[PDB]
Design a binder for this molecule. Structure first.
Ligand SMILES: [Ca+2]
Ligand SMILES: [Ca+2]
Lengths: 231, 184
């Protein structure tokens, strides 16, 4: 007499990750820990439906290292949308998705944008360079304190220098790399040196992108043009 | 001639840059006068650089009893009259250093403001860059002289599109300070 059932879900522990739209892989380092829980619901078939009188939790198991992002890449996930830069990327275990404890597919949060887009409007232009200059001036006159200065005039930041969107803008805006600690995509705004070389580099990239000889490169291989600019 | 308060720190910054002399930028501050209580005009100017630079970022210093006229106190922006040397800039920003000043500036009772200008190509000009106004204390004594100079920060600039380090070394090592003298 009816009935016995199991399924399984995942508790996932992860951090956000910043990416350029040109990048070909997401970083699984975003996944700090994942554990597959397995429940055993039992009871009886009901009138149209199911009733659960018991549930037996089998020993859960760490699968942090078995998790992948399947075929998703920043380049194939990026979609230009006004005031929207976040994506929930599904994880895959044994080549299939997993439900979380709320019955939704397990995902990790990423943010994806255009290098040089300080103001998060999906266009790299002179206004990104002048924003970056404003930040240069403000941090040149406060003891290099990033916590009282909002870099991006984006409404997603809204004047909050601690917003995740300001860290992201800083990641996008730090186009000229600086001597010192070798930074990863996981750096905080405060760790980056964003200064008049970044501002000038963004202005030069924009100006070059506007002229005929560079249009093909700007559209198709913008990293090559950034490299020309920053040398 | 030295008006950079932390000149030896600057010297270290430019230690490996060739020191070519000859034709470079001559940055200067003005020598003006004002009555006690008045707003003194102070002008930074650059000669011998017309069409030869694309960015600057400069810290000017002054006794901290002098207060620069503000545009927006909350953004810390400083009011200034733009001169011919900054015409056709793409962006310019001028801000007052209020918090986190270096010990060399606090110890010597200095205030500081920073002007940055950015051009698209070497459009930087010559002559006056910016004129600021400073409040001279009501109780200031006739004959009092207020020295105007600079502070060197590692990220400061006076550079051309070609990014030729010697051009910047010359500019920073040949700067001239200025004064405000209180009259009756
Ligand atoms: Ca933009
Ligand atoms: Ca940088």
């Amino acid at each position: 007499v009816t009935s016995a059932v199991k399924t399984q879900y995942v508790e996932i522990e992860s951090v956000m990750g910043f990416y350029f739209n040109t990048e070909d892989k997401f970083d699984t380092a975003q996944i700090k820990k994942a554990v597959l829980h397995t429940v055993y619901n039992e009871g009886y078939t009901d009138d149209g439906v199911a009733v659960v009188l018991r549930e037996y939790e089998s020993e859960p198991v760490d699968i942090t290292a078995e998790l992948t992002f399947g075929d998703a890449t920043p380049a194939n996930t990026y979609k230009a949308v006004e005031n929207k830069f976040d994506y929930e990327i599904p994880v895959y275990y044994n080549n299939a998705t997993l439900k979380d404890a709320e019955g939704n597919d397990a995902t990790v949060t990423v943010y994806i944008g255009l290098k040089g887009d300080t103001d998060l409007n999906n266009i790299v232009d002179g206004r990104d360079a002048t924003a970056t200059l404003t930040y240069y001036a403000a941090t040149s006159t406060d003891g290099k304190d990033a916590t009282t200065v909002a870099l991006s005039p984006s409404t997603l930041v809204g004047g909050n220098p601690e917003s995740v969107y300001d860290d992201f803008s800083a990641f996008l805006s730090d186009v000229k790399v600086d001597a010192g600690k070798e930074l990863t995509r996981f750096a905080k705004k405060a760790e980056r040196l964003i200064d008049g070389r970044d501002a000038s580099s963004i202005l030069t990239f924009y100006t070059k992108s506007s002229v005929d000889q560079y249009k093909d490169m700007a559209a198709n291989e913008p990293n090559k043009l950034w490299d020309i600019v920053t040398a | 001639n030295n008006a950079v308060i932390n000149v030896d720190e600057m010297n270290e910054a430019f230690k490996d840059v060739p020191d070519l002399e000859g034709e470079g930028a001559h940055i200067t501050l003005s020598n003006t006068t004002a009555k006690p209580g008045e707003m003194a005009e102070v002008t930074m100017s650059v000669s011998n650089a017309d069409m030869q630079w694309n960015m600057c970022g400069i810290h000017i210093i002054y006794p901290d009893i002098l207060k620069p006229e503000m545009k927006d106190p909350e953004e810390r922006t400083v009011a200034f009259q733009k001169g011919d040397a900054l015409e056709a800039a793409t962006g310019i920003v001028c801000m007052e250093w209020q918090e986190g000043l270096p010990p060399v500036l606090t110890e010597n009772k200095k205030g500081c403001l920073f002007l940055t200008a950015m051009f698209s190509g070497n459009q930087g000009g010559e002559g006056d860059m910016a004129t600021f106004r400073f409040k001279v204390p009501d109780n200031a004594e006739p004959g009092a002289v207020y020295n105007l100079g600079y502070y060197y920060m590692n990220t400061d600039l006076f550079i051309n599109e070609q990014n030729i380090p010697t051009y910047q070394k010359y500019a920073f090592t040949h700067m001239e300070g200025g004064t405000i003298t209180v009259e009756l």
